[PDB]
Design a protein around this ligand. Structure first.
Ligand code: ATP
Ligand code: ATP
Ligand code: MG
Ligand code: MG
Ligand code: ZN
Lengths: 277, 52, 294, 299, 276, 52
């Protein structure tokens, strides 16, 4: 209680070490009395501040401590629950040596107290952006993968901005980026995202590289046929083919693109397991 | 041009065939993330470095 | 025998410098001093202060929080710390959990980190630190950790094949560089009291039998009286102090006074560490003792 | 909260009393005190002061030499010590390239120390009775000590996931599960931490204690040793720092048995001087009445 | 300026002080590899502590001596065994770590000698010590592998035990006698087997006065007892082992069926040692 | 007396037979303790207590 004053004092005084623990000791006291709500607020708040003061250590510690309480008080995953953690994620230094740790800590909690096997979507969007701040592209790609619509937007931009950065682009180069969107979203069975991500990416590819093409439409579906990117064509046809779940179409598409069936061996194999039983 | 005609006739025909009857999975379909069990097969690593 | 640790502090060959002794003495404080004194004396070199002690105190000494990932000490340009925590060290890399709660896990892991720096020089990745000061635990458990190289060897011997070759080599290197008086030495932390002094003599005897270099002996918490208790306690200290000069005549004995408070923060730590470079002198530094208060 | 350890010292239910904390504080000295104070306060009971610390200091504290076989403390009628040495502890059970290499492996200290604990449990079951009513421990610093206190649980969680070989398994689970329920019983086993008036000690104490309660260990004592209690320039100055951590101590541990202790004008050794200083753990030190006993331990 | 220091403390009543002070100074000799000096210092210091009834300190130094012994690779000889023997005499038969000390030196006696079980001379001294602690069985073995004196103490050990018996029996006498015959027959010491058997049988006859008649033939004598069939069998077994003749062995066992079952294990080994 | 005659005639005869020719091991024989490999088979524990 009255001690609270004396420590925040040490904070706004230049004694980070002092304040961090003093708070923790007082915090552990709240938990001891099972006054969880009080603890959650104390710890969480104190962390954010340490992060704002650029005190990576102390801050990261409290963040975990909060999670520890979260799992102790069995805090269910909801808006207010995710909010606190999200708020903290924004103050985390993308260079924090234990970034991935923090990310995992909360995501784990999001899973244990939710019906999502991979964590809460909303929380993912925030986490994804953070990982990218640390140039952890691959790690980010996955979180956005299982995120919200915004995650999709950042995901397509993540790949696109990467494709452009390429100095020695190639016919197969474009496929390396595009295929990811199609496959990844086809793995989590998110046809809506697969189509929208594919739409934004293909349009940007066309308005920048100006590849000679002609749109082929039929029954409502459209395939942006590229005269110099056979890979892109195959990948687009694969998307629609998975929607039909028809074994014949799957076999026909692969028999025509023998090399692409070998270049996307593993992927096509799983697709036959998910959309063809 | 007619250099990519063979593949064009394939893509165009395959599409027509794959959409005569409404596909089993509509474009506005999205398996709730509460049901996704796995993340499919790991894709290859891009030979490009990232930054921003 | 020069009453200072200059020879070492300025040495350019050493890479591993252990700091052990009974508990409470100040193995973390003294190590904090040795660390600051080397990073300042050796500019073009990067130093690392890792604590294998389960009960990490480096964070307490300096003040700032240290974790599983090396963190440069605030104020220094070439000096980082660590402090390996078994639990978190096993979660990052029903069995795993139960592994970080078994007696001895501290040593094992602490040694794995040592293996990590050896595997790196071989990997061509280079070296991240020139010298490493250790904040070991009391005499007992510490000797156990120092025996890990030999034990891990005598065990590994009595035994993907290329992986075991990489391990055998890495560890062996440790065995060769640890028995080298120029690469690794031992600095004991004791006070002016029987139970400490005597445990020191014992600890040291073991070290030489381990073929470990012992070229330093710090006598901390000395009163150097000249109230009734301080003058009375100084009397006892001088008793063990004179004996110390006998047992360790051909050794680098560096005495150290008792401050009027706790020595923490790179600021006050460096102020007290200067006496390990240039022996304390009541005639010239009789006022610095009270400068660390508050 | 009574500022003394009378409740315990006179307790007749307790059988295991650990003495841990950071190093250097005096885990051996304080334990030496707790030992003498209980053997004197509890006449019709036999006590044992065993040190699991690899670097035994009980022999140094008392003075006389202790070995692998229990030895009554010179001067006492119901108080023996031990101090298990891994090496010799493996040569005796073996004579009765693996055995030798076993006493040189990190953690051997704990393992064996626990085997001795198992030895006293197996005896009460064997009908042989008990050789000691209570046991004071001279553990090592906070760290490694917690590892030893986790041995019961670990040895259990491990033993579980497992021709007389079937009999042993039974005499193994039991002996362990007992030590487990024994330590989780606030009336049979308690924990006495040894700290000083200094941040790095105080803070490490708060941490140590929190862990203990999560281990379901009884913590009903806190000794603050090496206090100056000034009222030269250094003593008055250092006392200033001690009073700072002392007041904070009264806060964090208000509902705890806080027993302050002064800094003697010398080292406390030998049943003689040890008992003279231990009396303050029974009856809180009072400058007004005992302001002269502090200098009686010198020489 | 050091040897006196602690001995001044020893007299002033400071055993703890002197013991370690000596050890520290001792380890110093070893450090300088001045083994001979160490051996003397430690050894002497121990004896004194033992004479002062300081079981602890004393026992410690004794081991420390052995530690150096094994370090300086001190070979087993008269002077080497002598020091340890001298110390054994000052050891309290009640010393909780008696067996430890005993084993310590005996181990050394083995490592630095051609004896697989230790030096005989050292055994005689050790044996007596064990007995002082009432460790009869443990003593029996050391005397077993000792000198002629060991044999004398061995027969006396068993005899004095047999007499202490309140409810003696026909098979009782066999329990003691058989030991001598078997034990010495195991280490192939016919000389000791005969002499131990002679002293024991004569004492048995001059105290219990059992009706008997000595049977002689070709130089060998079997004290036939009219009421101790076990003793007869045991005596015949001794001589039979000397012949190493399979037939005799079979004949002796076929006549004494019950004794062949009562001494099953033993006879089995005897057929392995004296009959290949 | 003649009560133990049967056994007496055995012991007496067995001795005579076992000593016609000098036994392979003389009475003055003693395998140097430097050659003893084992201590034979462990004998049973006496049912009597010792002391002195
Ligand atoms: N020169 C000194 N004079 C007085 N007190 C000191 C001095 N140096 C260190 N200390 C005290 O010791 C503390 C540091 O203890 P550390 O040295 O952290 O103990 P420790 O070695 O970790 O104990 P252990 O070895 O059992 O782990 C500081 O809090 C300080 O108050
Ligand atoms: N109450 C006290 N007053 C004054 N000095 C003390 C006190 N307690 C201990 N000491 C000092 O500490 C020494 C005893 O340390 P011990 O208490 O032997 O350390 P330790 O507990 O064995 O360290 P560790 O726990 O790591 O093994 C004595 O020499 C004495 O000078
Ligand atoms: Mg330390
Ligand atoms: Mg201690
Ligand atoms: Zn003073």
């Amino acid at each position: 209680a009255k001690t609270l004053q004396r420590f925040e004092n040490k904070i706004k005084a230049g004694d980070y070490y002092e304040a961090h623990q003093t708070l923790r000791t007082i915090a552990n006291r709240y938990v001891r009395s099972k006054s969880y709500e009080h603890a959650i607020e104390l710890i969480s708040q104190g962390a954010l501040s340490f992060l704002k003061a650029k005190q990576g250590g102390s801050g990261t510690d409290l963040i975990f401590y909060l999670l520890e309480v979260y799992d102790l008080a069995e805090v269910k995953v909801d808006d207010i629950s995710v909010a606190r953690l999200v708020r903290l994620i924004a103050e985390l230094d993308p260079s924090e040596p234990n970034l991935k740790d923090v990310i995992t800590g909360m995501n784990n909690w999001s899973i244990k107290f939710s019906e999502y096997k991979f964590g809460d979507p909303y929380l993912h969007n925030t986490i994804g952006s953070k990982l990218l701040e640390g140039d952890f592209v691959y790690e980010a790609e996955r979180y956005f993968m299982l995120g919200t619509h915004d995650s999709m937007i950042k995901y397509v931009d993540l790949l696109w901005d990467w494709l452009c950065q390429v100095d020695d682009i190639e016919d197969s180069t474009v496929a390396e980026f595009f295929s990811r969107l199609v496959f990844n979203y086809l793995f989590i069975s998110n046809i809506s995202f697969a189509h929208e991500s594919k739409d934004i990416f293909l349009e940007r590819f066309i308005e920048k590289f100006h590849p000679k093409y002609e749109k082929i439409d039929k029954n409502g579906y459209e395939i942006v046929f590229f005269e110099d990117y056979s890979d892109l064509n195959f990948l687009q046809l694969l998307l629609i083919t998975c929607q039909t779940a028809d074994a014949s179409y799957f076999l026909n598409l692969k028999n025509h693109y023998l090399d692409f069936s070998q270049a996307y061996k593993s992927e096509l194999e799983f697709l036959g397991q998910e959309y063809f039983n | 041009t007619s250099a990519s005609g063979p593949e064009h006739e394939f893509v165009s025909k395959f599409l027509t065939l794959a959409t005569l009857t409404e596909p089993k999975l509509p474009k506005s379909y999205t398996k709730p993330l509460k049901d996704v069990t796995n993340l499919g097969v790991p894709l290859p690593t891009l030979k490009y470095k990232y930054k921003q | 025998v020069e009453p200072n640790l200059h020879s070492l502090i300025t040495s350019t060959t050493h890479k591993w410098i252990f700091v052990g002794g009974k508990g409470g003495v100040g193995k973390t404080t003294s190590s904090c001093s040795i660390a600051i004194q080397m990073a300042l004396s050796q500019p073009n070199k990067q130093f690392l202060l890792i604590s294998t002690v389960p009960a990490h105190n480096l964070s307490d000494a300096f003040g700032e929080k240290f974790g599983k990932d090396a963190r440069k000490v605030t104020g220094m340009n070439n000096l980082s710390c660590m402090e390996i925590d078994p639990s978190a060290a096993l979660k990052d890399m029903a069995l795993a959990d139960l592994t970080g709660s078994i007696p001895g896990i501290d040593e094992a892991l602490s040694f794995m980190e040592v293996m990590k720096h050896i595997k790196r020089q071989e990997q061509g990745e280079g070296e991240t630190f020139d010298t490493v000061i250790f904040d070991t635990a009391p005499t007992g458990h510490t000797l156990r950790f120092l025996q890990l190289p030999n034990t891990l060897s005598k065990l590994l011997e009595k035994f993907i094949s290329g992986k075991l070759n990489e391990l055998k080599a890495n560890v062996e290197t440790i065995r060769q560089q640890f028995t080298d008086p120029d690469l690794t030495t031992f600095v004991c932390v004791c006070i002016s009291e029987f139970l400490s002094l005597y445990e020191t003599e014992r600890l040291i005897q073991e070290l030489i039998s381990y073929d470990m270099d012992v070229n330093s002996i710090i006598v901390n918490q000395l009163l150097f009286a000249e109230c009734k208790r301080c003058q009375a306690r100084w009397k006892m200290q001088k008793k063990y102090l004179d004996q110390i000069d006998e047992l360790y005549e051909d050794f680098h004995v560096v005495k150290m006074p008792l401050c009027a408070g706790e020595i923490r923060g790179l600021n006050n730590l460096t102020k007290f560490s200067q006496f390990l470079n240039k022996e304390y002198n009541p005639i010239t530094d009789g006022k610095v003792i009270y400068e660390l208060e508050d």
